[PDB]
Symmetry: D2
Subunit: 355 residues, 4 copies
């Protein structure tokens, strides 16, 4: 168990940006700018800084050329400059490795703290950031598939309860989770900004980054991303969806970038900002929990995820999950799922839904 | 081959309605009225007559209680009363069994001809029908999943070229098809009304009815049907989709009624009314041909379809396809498909996609 | 206008308009950069444009000239022989015709242009150069994509006279607007099984009221408005967006650099059955044009494009003598209602929603 | 100027519900339930309690039968029980009348404080509320026009800077405003929950309630409300819209209930939760500021609004605005608006846009 520090937690506003290491900056640019339409805040020969349509902070995504594709930092903005001090004291008490840079790690961010957190993830906390033109009314630029906000991160970690307690102490509130009747937790979702999630934990071998998620305005915008990928004859990079989630209630899609970093497109979850927001727990065998329409979850969604780096830029060692596997208990040879609890009709034994 | 009659073909306007035999009328009512929101044109203890939001003819669907669920008739509206006579002469010349009822087979249809067509399907041709309130501006009745038009039928038949030529002789024009390099035809789509299809042929054991399709206004209306089915905890009756079709370019969904009759929801195909409308042929191994996004086609979509009846109400015997199977050549053990022709990356062998 | 003995040509649909424009570059910016139409051909004299789902060569030809005007509204006919039928039909009507075996504009073959009995330059053709049908080119699809040509709309002074002539030509009336004293203000009529291929608006004419393009969805029309706001050209949004009464379509009217009016349109209904029910609206029904009762801007009733004769000269305007829709609905002596017979929700001497004429 | 109390401000979460007095409860029920599709939490012969599709607190709207239609309370939820005490101390320090009911003023609310605020508005602060079934996945109930959340209130008040400062001290941050070049503020928008607004100030004679706003998921849901009102032949109850706002960037519609209470339908504004969120100031003469497409703002939008009650249930006296009128300076006889700053072309002098004048 990760202890609760005496030191006060920093006041975290929201997920703000991810730094992803990519192997071929031009191929990555083509995906994120030409295919997906993200907006360039800054670029050079080593990095591309990208933002969503409604963003005013400098960026939501930094693509950094490197030898090994991986998550380098998942950054959360805090409420005040003093909250970066609070973050530093909090993680030091946790016994975590930290590094503070008054002029930032990436362009457009000022005083920033990176940490190797108790789950092995590279978290950044910052307040100071360079404001840019907020493009929210630039309908002359708006794409039929426009990505309008950064919504969340999702982390693969082997022990979900352990991670959950730590994030709650940090001020994240759990909104939804997946458990079974034998005391196992498979996943949890947790927030600061008053949507379903700013980050989320998926049970599995980790630390690995499961995905970064961007929002659209409407469901047809997600449909258009699929249609465009069909026209570009890259439909093989559509991993899963489009669908309606059970957990979160959002319309969604998962696609794969050139380094197999997974990107979710997401819209129309609900408000969670009240402190007694009702927590929703799904059973792992409920075939409407991940896709509300019962569409099967492809095995790659459970097994594949991105490496993460430590503060020296080296890949974190992966620790094996020993708790039961969501893949195995739902779609593996001895798995089970149901449509209606207690009804044999519409249940699946040893296979995925829909044939 | 089915020879072309010397008798002139009836002038067919469009698909108009289907009569489905159902085993439990109340359960079927629940599905078509309460889940799907179709509008009641007439009902009693034996039948429910239903129409879409924009329809002015009496109905687009008749649910008839009976012992064995099946298609009883797929009905096309013809241009004039005289076209019913032309239909009778045409099918008589083909040597088909016909039945003419001057006052109709179902309520709200007048003079009507039913035939056991050369592919074993029960076709009806009629002109006269009772007009009803056209609900196209009744937004006080509009559902979040509103079904707005009847769009098409899809028939399973063993020899697609044979059926295609017969339908061409009847004035249907092929818009799209699926073939391979060996010259096998797996499916064809063909129209009268100036959309992609009024009926369609799927290669397989037949005669069987693959589906009846209704359209929505927008893609979100199809999404809502899925969402509603999840809320009703009947997501197991979502068979395939939602998706974008390759063939037709329509946004689509397939669902299953209480007797396993398959219903497609469909929107936003394209205009085909010019007589030189370009015909599109897809390769059977193209994994974007059926679902443009490359999502796999579940085997039940290829293998399962509804029985059809003869004019006595008995189930039509089935003839097994001898041409190659689309299922087998794409997703079966010796099948394959591609994302990009000639590229092993994104190809699938002995396996479906994704 | 008498019904010829000669058979009418079999008309499939509206197919394209040729508009004369004064500044080709400014017109290009509007139709290509703002509206996203697709270039089939262009040079210093003309720009040929098509919608997303079209396979014929073009739906719009922009021709540089001194005086902005409609030069031709073109209908495609079913067979080559129907061009001969059109020629014989209009000759019997006593109309001026011109036949060009190799077309008037690029990508059209054998074509007949006529100065029709209402003074409009109609073209009939079958032969056209097929192009890449872009209907699945989602790599090109814009948030405001125009997917088809839907219809034309013509200003003419005597609507019944025009209606009868178009009925003889094979168009079928779907909807109209009349009053209780027997005046007709507008009529809509079709060949292709939608609400309209052309339409008549009562007023001084011949003038071209608009050309209409379709979108897939209502949000595509909303995006056009949003984009025009972002470009700071919201003053070129004339009217809308709205829901029509007549046609039931979602709509918008915008103005090109020469004030040619373009409608964007979606989700009208099927009309292909021969006994398709006609719908007649009362002129005082404030839901007939905008279903939500939003006021119809006066320019919509007064402004429209000049049309040319076959020499390229502007057609003389003939004044409407029947009552004016503007005057009887939104002028100082006008009225409209929300519910027939109800004073609540009625408007007298002004438009709906609190406005009078500017 | 309203002074900043020494006492700490309550921590306000969000707007939570309004109580509207209505004259004919059945007619009001038909509007809010049958026309608009709000979900009944409770009703009797005197009150109807309604919530939106995604709500889990007891209600977002209470309709209370009474002799004079008016706003009775605009209610904000606070973060903790202790924040109700803080609200009481805060308003007392401001010299405002307060009333505390341990078991609530309306059903499904617990310990609650109502106040006559410094602008004459009846505010409620509460934490405790009865949870109900959250209908957010009840797609079997979902309407083509479904109202999914309560979004905001909008208040008419004569002195916008005076109100703005008071609300800022209370912790609301201004996200957008409308000013001119002569020092006049015509309107301001301010939030707690991280959308553009939880409440808003519109310059005018007040206190009056301008509107209550509900959100939809998508723009087509707003269009459906319009379409349905046409089918019901109540298009005369569509006041303004649908449109795209400049301020807020939301797609919108304004409609009028049976007592002329104005309801906004709203979707797809942007995130404001960062504390340095950029404040956007529009010039009052910019004809894209209220409707981005330049559609004219109907004069009733500027002149009509609902009465508000004091804690005794009597109507609050109206105080006249002396600052310049947005109506007058934009669409009135000496008004002006532009499409492009400094361009005569597309400007409007002494009339509205798109060919209209004031009736
Ligand atoms: O591509 N296919 O799977 C198709 C295309 C159109 C259809 O109507 C259909 O039922 C199947
Ligand atoms: Ca000034
Ligand atoms: Cl999921
Ligand atoms: Cl109109
Ligand atoms: Cl506004
Ligand atoms: Fe996610
Ligand atoms: Fe189909
Ligand atoms: Fe039109
Ligand atoms: Fe508002």
């Amino acid at each position: 168990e990760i202890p609760k520090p005496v030191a006060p937690a920093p006041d975290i506003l929201r997920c703000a940006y991810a730094e992803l290491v990519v192997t071929d900056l031009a191929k990555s640019r083509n995906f994120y700018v030409d295919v997906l339409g993200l907006h360039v805040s800054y670029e050079d020969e080593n990095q591309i800084y990208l933002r969503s349509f409604e963003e005013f902070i400098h960026h939501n995504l930094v693509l950094t050329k490197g030898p090994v594709a991986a998550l380098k930092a998942m950054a959360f903005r805090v409420r005040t400059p003093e909250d970066v001090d609070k973050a530093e004291a909090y993680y030091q008490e946790l016994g975590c490795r930290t590094e503070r840079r008054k002029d930032g790690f990436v362009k457009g961010i000022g005083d920033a703290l990176r940490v190797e957190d108790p789950l092995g993830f590279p978290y950044e906390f910052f307040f100071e950031t360079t404001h840019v033109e907020r493009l929210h009314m630039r309908y002359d630029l708006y794409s039929a598939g426009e990505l309008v906000r950064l919504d969340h991160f999702n982390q693969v970690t082997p022990d979900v309860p352990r991670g959950r307690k730590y994030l709650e102490d940090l001020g994240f509130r759990v909104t939804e989770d997946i458990q079974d009747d034998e005391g196992t937790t498979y996943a949890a979702w947790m927030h600061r900004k008053g949507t379903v999630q700013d980050t989320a934990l998926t049970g599995g071998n980790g630390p690995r980054l499961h995905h970064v998620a961007f929002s659209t305005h409407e469901k047809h915008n997600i449909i258009q991303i699929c249609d465009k990928m069909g026209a570009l004859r890259i439909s093989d990079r559509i991993e899963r969806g489009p669908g309606r989630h059970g957990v979160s209630n959002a319309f969604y899609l998962y696609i794969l970038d050139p380094d197999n970093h997974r990107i979710e497109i997401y819209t129309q979850d609900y408000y969670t900002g009240d402190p007694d927001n009702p927590t929703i727990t799904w059973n792992v065998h409920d075939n409407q929990r991940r896709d509300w329409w019962g569409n099967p979850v492809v095995p790659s969604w459970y097994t594949e995820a991105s490496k993460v780096l430590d503060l020296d830029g080296n890949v974190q060692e992966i620790i094996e999950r020993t708790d039961d596997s969501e893949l195995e208990v739902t779609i593996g040879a001895d798995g089970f799922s149901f449509t209606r609890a207690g009804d044999e009709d519409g249940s699946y034994h040893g296979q995925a839904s829909k044939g």
